[PDB]
From Swiss-Prot, chain A:
GO terms for molecular function: 14-3-3 protein binding; ubiquitin-like ligase-substrate adaptor activity. The keyword Nucleotide-binding does not apply. The modification Phosphotyrosine is found at residue 436. The gene is KLHL22. This is Kelch-like protein 22. It is found in: Cytoplasm, Cytosol; Cytoplasm, Cytoskeleton, Microtubule organizing center, Centrosome; Cytoplasm, Cytoskeleton, Spindle; Nucleus. The keyword Phosphoprotein applies.
Swiss-Prot record, chain C:
It is an enzyme of class 1 (oxidoreductase). It catalyses: L-glutamate + NAD(+) + H2O = 2-oxoglutarate + NH4(+) + NADH + H(+); L-glutamate + NADP(+) + H2O = 2-oxoglutarate + NH4(+) + NADPH + H(+). One of its GO terms (cellular component) is endoplasmic reticulum. Changing residue 439 to Y: In HHF6; abolishes inhibition by ATP; no effect on activation by ADP; Strongly reduces inhibition by GTP. It is found in: Mitochondrion; Endoplasmic reticulum. This is Glutamate dehydrogenase 1, mitochondrial. The modification N6-(2-hydroxyisobutyryl)lysine is found at residue 81. NAD(+) binds at residues 75-77, 110, 186, 378. It comes from Homo sapiens. Gene3D superfamilies: 1.10.287.140, Leucine Dehydrogenase, chain A, domain 1, NAD(P)-binding Rossmann-like Domain. Mitochondrial glutamate dehydrogenase that catalyzes the conversion of L-glutamate into alpha-ketoglutarate. Plays a key role in glutamine anaplerosis by producing alpha-ketoglutarate, an important intermediate in the tricarboxylic acid cycle. Plays a role in insulin homeostasis. May be involved in learning and memory reactions by increasing the turnover of the excitatory neurotransmitter glutamate. Its EC number is 1.4.1.3. The modification ADP-ribosylcysteine is found at residue 106. The gene is GLUD1. It holds the Pfam family ELFV_dehydrog.
Length: 570, 123, 486
């Protein structure tokens, strides 16, 4: 409760005070005579004038508390440079103080100074100073300019073959860049030839662990298959054969998951595309723009042949979504014929076979021979026919009736685990609440809900699903229910959360780095959907502006695929 | 102040003014007069201009100087709501607070009230 | 929604509720009574609307045209009653909707009038007294030509934007040009000042009506046992929003008969004092200078006064003060609509859900038309009320007291003196006037109307939804009147 305010001009005042103390000729506490030269200066000012001097002679060791301090490898050039930097308050290199500084920094045992000299040489590297640049790189080899040096060596391998800079250039960075497949390149024909020429001499074109360090199967094999066919035999050709069968397995994409088919990167977010938007905005969402964290905005790009699916299902099963049909009659029914599946692992999309029964807005788990749906229902009304949705196989077969009569219910795999809280007989609230887990396909015993509350907003609290309060007409008004009931078997204790202002009825479930975000909602008072998106964190106990989607839709499916080049470049 | 620290002194003065109790009223004006700070006087003047309504009911208005109060009222910067409140404050400044809760002698500070700015019926 | 649709849906609800019982309750032939329900669709539209355009000489020699309107909703009772509004926001839809409301307004309180409304598209602040004089004279003459001013046809009344000053002009301009040969020429218009034939107690009519309407419902055990009141004298607190004529009068009477006014609001900032506010002091303060800002012994309350804790709420202000958002956040127990539709139908279901009693505006503020009816009767009678009976009643009371005194003295031998009346009775005898009779009639009318509304609501199995009960009662009365003729 004290606080501390620091001015931004205090550095100038400190420098002026140090200069005044130095020019006063008094307040001297440390006297050192080296090489017969006697000078008067402040110890603090001298330490602050340089960078490594403060860490060397003022480290609090035994030598820092002695009348005489022993310095080895310190030449007159270093002292002159320190004095010039202190007087001019400038730290930069020139055409007459580049080689000398690098030469004098080798014996100074200063890694920061060597790295700065190497960076300055790289920033002032020309054809006439190749030897000096190579010497500076060999002296320091900074971890920040290593990638740039490796890229320069690779891009000019023809000149680097006879140049001494190749031996002093980094080797691990070049090898990593060569095996990398996400590097920015305008073409894959001249670039491939240049990479081949850089990696191996032209004579070869016309044990070593580094040779096996390249993960050919991990990289893009589509363009390297021709090169590998003519190359020597390797055990990396099995992945190409395995991926060939994946082209004709669009329906079984989630089932055809492989150990080498892991999801590249963790760029998971919310894209304002898909779904059916009826309220509060009467505008159809069509712009498929991906938000760029570096840019902070979802810049528009050429969304040519973008996957446009309306009222599609939302599921998270190993980054692969499988759904049949689509129904959003609660927020306004809208017939659609386009079905799309988000499969970022395969980086491709295809039109799945439409099932006979439009059952969606449920929990889909990648288990067994096919995805199983809990009972089923029509678009907006319950039906006496019970069947299982199999969009992958397009097989309409009768299934056994479910233990609990649920039609157009809401369910999702929270944190990779299927869970259900309370229930609702469609759009009409009921009195009996039963929790049936879609994953187990059975009515598992759970704690009975004392209060008939359902269709509430669920967020990620204590790394588990939690429903607190609610908004419905069962309480007689638009108030907040004081009783909060949450079932956390893994946690073992109730997770306290703030009441959800907007109910979440059959909405899309999205996980973005363990940060739950809610778009749209149910607003009984307004007689329509929610025109604004609000996130109410329990710990924060405040309302903060989160990522605002372009369209305020409810239950809009999120598609993850290959982004456009313009969108990727931001 | 002796250390020539404007920010810390100003922050301390603002904190004291914002946390000044009624029982420590005499500890504010005397401190401002003794310290002669370039910022404490302005803070005290702002507090007076913002809490003159509260001070009129209490005895702080009587303790405050009459000339300074009249000078502050004369400037077109004080926050007022109605001319009746201004007249009551002028009477409290120019007469005993207990007596109000004497118009025989027309004080000079009474002329500071803008007669045309008052309500026609009230005037 | 707007006002027209809001008042139009109420009639549809009332007719739909009434028809089922009305088919058999009035049957006296081939079960064709269902086809007789065209009577209900006759009541909906206004019979006649007229638009005017007349010139004015102006004070600078220029010429201008002025548009005016007048509507007549129902003709089932020959004399029509309505107001005249001077505003630039007037329109034909507004005047016809107001006339439609006025018909049921009169029907609820057993006033044998029709329904009308007039509006002149003019801004009074832009004209001096002479221009307003000319406007009123020309408008009255134009209305008289077509037959919308006659004492036995149509009777205007003052609105919020007009006063008795304009009606004084209307009366003598009608009584000297067209109705010169009419003995009842001065009865054409009500609301005029006393000197030309006004009535006493006309100023405090609406406040008295509001207070009597509240009292008639705050003394019913059956209705207040639903929430729990122990009512009538439990020092129940109330807040008044809007300090106009009706709010001031009703608040004074409520305070006089044992109520505490906690907060008073207006368009600008409000005040609050849990100790209560003296009506006379507040009225004097407001009369002294403008609004009630800076009232002594009144804390300047901040926030929505409509949600303030109280027992009785009096929204006497502009339309739709209470909405869906405000409805669940209020703490009042009884809502007394003192203006024209303070609440929206979307928020009425909210109040009904949480059993909050809402006294309809159609019934609460009928004192203005009741006293207008009394003034019309006085103008027809050519004599002030009670002039020929006060001395007779005083002598009769004195004779009764003397007789009981003598008879009591006869048995007990000393001489007892029961002849002396109480102080209140003596003051009532000494200062008898017309205002007493007017107030008595107003109270009787309000009490009878409240009893009828309660019995109708009980009969059609309605709960606290008194608005529908009042509308059903008015529609049933109009149907009964209109059926037995055609």
């Amino acid at each position: 409760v004290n606080n501390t305010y620091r001015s931004a001009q205090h550095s100038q005042a400190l420098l002026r005070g140090l200069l005044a103390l130095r020019d006063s000729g008094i307040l001297f506490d440390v006297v050192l005579v080296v090489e017969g030269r006697h000078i008067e200066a402040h110890r603090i000012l001298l330490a602050a004038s340089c960078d490594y001097f403060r860490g060397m002679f003022a480290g609090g060791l035994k030598e820092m508390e002695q009348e005489e301090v022993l310095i080895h490898g310190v030449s007159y050039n270093a002292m002159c440079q320190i004095l010039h930097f202190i007087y001019t308050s400038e730290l930069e290199l020139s055409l007459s103080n580049v080689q000398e500084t690098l030469v004098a920094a080798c014996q100074l045992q200063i890694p920061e100074i060597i790295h700065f000299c190497c960076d300055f040489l790289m920033s002032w590297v020309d054809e006439e100073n190749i030897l000096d640049v190579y010497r500076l790189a060999e002296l320091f080899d900074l971890s920040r300019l290593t990638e740039q040096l490796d890229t320069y060596i690779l891009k000019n391998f023809v000149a680097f073959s006879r140049t001494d800079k190749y031996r002093q250039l980094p080797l691990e960075k070049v090898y990593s860049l060569l095996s990398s497949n996400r590097l920015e390149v305008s073409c894959e024909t001249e670039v491939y030839e240049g990479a081949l020429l850089y990696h191996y001499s032209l004579e070869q074109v016309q044990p070593p662990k580094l040779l096996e360090t390249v993960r050919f199967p991990l990289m893009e094999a589509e363009v390297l298959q021709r090169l590998h066919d003519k190359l020597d035999p390797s055990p990396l050709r099995d992945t190409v054969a395995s991926a060939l069968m994946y082209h004709r397995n669009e329906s079984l994409q989630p089932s055809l998951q492989s150990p080498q088919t892991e999801l590249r990167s963790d760029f998971q977010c919310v894209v304002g595309f898909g779904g059916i938007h009826s309220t509060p905005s009467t505008v159809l969402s069509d712009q498929a723009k991906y938000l760029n964290p570096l840019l902070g905005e979802w810049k528009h790009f050429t969304a040519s042949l973008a996957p446009r699916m309306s009222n599609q299902g939302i599921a998270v099963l190993n980054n692969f979504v499988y759904l049949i049909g689509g129904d959003n009659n609660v927020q306004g029914f809208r017939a659609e014929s386009r079905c799309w599946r988000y499969d970022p692992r395969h980086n491709r999309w295809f039109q799945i076979q439409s099932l006979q029964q439009e059952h969606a807005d449920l929990s889909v788990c990648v288990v067994g021979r096919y995805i199983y749906a809990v009972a089923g229902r029509d678009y907006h009304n319950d039906l006496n026919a019970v069947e299982r949705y199999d969009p992958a196989t397009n097989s309409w077969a009768y299934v056994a009736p479910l233990k609990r009569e649920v039609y157009a219910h809401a369910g999702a795999t929270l944190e990779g685990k299927m869970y259900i809280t309370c229930g609702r007989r469609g759009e009409d609230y009921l009195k009996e609440t039963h929790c049936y887990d879609p994953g187990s396909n059975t009515w598992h015993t759970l704690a009975d809900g004392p209060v008939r509350r359902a269709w509430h907003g669920m967020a990620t609290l204590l790394n588990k699903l939690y429903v607190i309060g609610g908004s419905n007409n069962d309480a007689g008004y638009r108030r907040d229910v004081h009783q909060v009931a949450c079932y956390s078997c893994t946690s073992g204790q109730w997770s306290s959360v703030c009441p959800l202002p907007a109910g979440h009825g059959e909405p899309g479930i999205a996980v973005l780095d363990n940060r739950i975000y809610v778009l749209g909602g149910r607003s009984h008072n307004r007689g329509s959907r929610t025109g604004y998106v609000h996130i109410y964190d329990v710990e924060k106990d405040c309302w903060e502006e989160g990522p605002q989607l372009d369209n305020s839709i409810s239950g809009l499916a999120a598609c993850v695929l290959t982004l456009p080049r313009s969108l990727l470049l931001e | 102040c002796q250390l020539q620290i404007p920010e810390i002194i100003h922050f301390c003065c603002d904190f004291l003014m914002s946390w000044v109790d009624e029982e420590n009223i005499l500890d504010v004006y005397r401190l401002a007069e003794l310290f002669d700070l370039s910022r404490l006087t302005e803070q005290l003047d702002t507090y007076i201009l913002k809490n003159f309504v509260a001070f009129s009911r209490t005895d702080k208005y009587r303790q405050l100087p009459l000339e300074k109060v009249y000078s502050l009222l004369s400037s077109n910067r004080l926050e007022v709501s109605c001319e009746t409140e201004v007249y009551e404050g002028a009477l409290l400044y120019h007469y005993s607070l207990e007596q109000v809760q004497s118009l025989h002698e027309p004080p000079k500070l009474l002329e500071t009230v803008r007669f045309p700015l008052m309500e026609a019926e009230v005037l | 929604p707007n006002f027209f649709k809001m008042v139009e849906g109420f009639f549809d609800r009332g007719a739909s509720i009434v028809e089922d019982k009305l088919v058999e309750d009035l049957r006296t032939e081939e079960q064709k009574r269902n086809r007789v329900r065209g009577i209900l669709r006759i009541i909906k539209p206004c019979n006649h609307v007229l638009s005017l355009s007349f010139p004015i000489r102006r004070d600078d020699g220029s010429w201008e045209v002025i548009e005016g309107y007048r509507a007549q909703h129902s003709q089932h009772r020959t004399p029509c009653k309505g107001g005249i509004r001077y505003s630039t926001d007037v329109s034909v839809d507004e005047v016809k909707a107001l006339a439609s409301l006025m018909t049921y307004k009169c029907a609820v309180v057993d006033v044998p009038f029709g329904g009308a409304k007039a509006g002149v598209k003019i801004n009074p602040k832009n004209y001096t007294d002479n221009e307003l004089e000319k406007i009123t004279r020309r408008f009255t003459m134009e209305l008289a030509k077509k037959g919308f001013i006659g004492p036995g046809i149509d009777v205007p009344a003052p609105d919020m934007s007009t006063g008795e000053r304009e009606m004084s002009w209307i009366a003598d301009t009608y009584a000297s040009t067209i109705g010169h040969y009419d003995i009842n020429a001065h009865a054409c218009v009500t609301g005029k000042p006393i000197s030309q034939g006004g009535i006493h107690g006309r100023i405090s009519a609406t406040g008295r009506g509001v207070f009597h309407g509240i009292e008639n419902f705050i003394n019913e055990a059956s209705y207040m046992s639903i929430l729990g009141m122990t009512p009538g004298f439990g020092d129940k607190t109330f807040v008044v929003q809007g300090f106009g004529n009706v709010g001031l009068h009703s608040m004074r009477y409520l305070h006089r008969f044992g109520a505490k006014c906690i907060a008073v609001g207006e368009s600008d900032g409000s005040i609050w004092n849990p100790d209560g506010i003296d009506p006379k002091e507040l009225e004097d303060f407001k009369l002294q200078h403008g609004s009630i800002l800076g009232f002594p012994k009144a804390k300047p309350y901040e926030g929505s006064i409509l949600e303030a804790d109280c027992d009785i709420l009096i929204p006497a202000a502009s339309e739709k003060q209470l909405t869906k958002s405000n409805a669940p956040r209020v703490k009042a127990k009884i809502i007394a609509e003192g203006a024209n539709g303070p609440t929206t139908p979307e928020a009425d279901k909210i109040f009904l859900e949480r059993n909050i009693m809402v006294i309809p505006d159609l019934y609460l503020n009928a004192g203005g038309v009741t006293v207008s009816y009394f003034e019309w009767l006085k103008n027809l009678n050519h004599v002030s009320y009670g002039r020929l009976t006060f001395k007779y009643e005083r002598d009769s009371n004195y004779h009764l007291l003397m007789s009981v005194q003598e008879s009591l003295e006869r048995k007990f031998g000393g001489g007892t003196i029961p002849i002396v009346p109480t102080a209140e009775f003596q003051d009532r005898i000494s200062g008898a006037s017309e205002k007493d009779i007017v107030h008595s009639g107003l109270a009787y009318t309000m009490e009878r109307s409240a009893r009828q509304i309660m019995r109708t609501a009980m009969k059609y199995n309605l709960g606290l939804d008194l608005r529908t009960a009042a509308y059903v009662n008015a529609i049933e009365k109009v149907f009964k009147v209109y059926n037995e003729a055609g």
